Design a binder for this molecule. Structure first.
Ligand SMILES: COc1cc(C(=O)NC2CCN(C)CC2)ccc1Nc1ncc2c(n1)N(C1CCCC1)CC(F)(F)C(=O)N2C
Length: 108
């Protein structure tokens, strides 16, 4: 849980506080957003709120599962959209800030 503790108390908390994380704090509502074939293209939707709940509920056994959830959220966004898009620019800056806090996680 030590790494998992750091993911929840440091990484998630820091990522959520960035103003441009707002698109990622809730699951993508493909209908209200009028997104065609979102659910056909993205078969594992993921978002920060779900990661929060999973960490609150100790859904994760190992830190690695949680890291994969962060990455899935990013890579879903990179796959469905195009380079240069606003939403991609936001994900890219969020991931850079993710990688930085993750690089200071307790070792081992
Ligand atoms: C909160 O509701 C929204 C409202 C508005 C909204 O109403 N914006 C207007 C209001 C203010 N003006 C100024 C600009 C338009 C825009 C987006 C919203 N939400 C959202 N959340 C997440 C995604 C997303 N959108 N996407 C965006 C990119 C292109 C249009 C959807 C693409 C995506 F594929 F779903 C994706 O990967 N993500 C992560």
């Amino acid at each position: 849980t030590n790494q998992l503790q750091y993911l929840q108390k440091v990484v998630l908390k820091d990522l959520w506080k960035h103003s441009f994380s707002w698109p990622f704090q809730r699951p993508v509502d493909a209908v209200k957003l009028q997104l065609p074939d979102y659910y056909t293209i993205i078969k594992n939707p993921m978002d920060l709120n779900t990661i929060k709940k999973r960490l609150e509920n100790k859904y994760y056994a190992k830190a690695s599962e949680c890291i994969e959830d962060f990455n899935t959220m990013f890579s879903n966004c990179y796959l469905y959209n195009k380079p240069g898009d606003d939403i991609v620019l936001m994900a890219q800056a969020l991931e850079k800030l993710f990688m930085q806090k993750l690089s200071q996680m307790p070792q081992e």
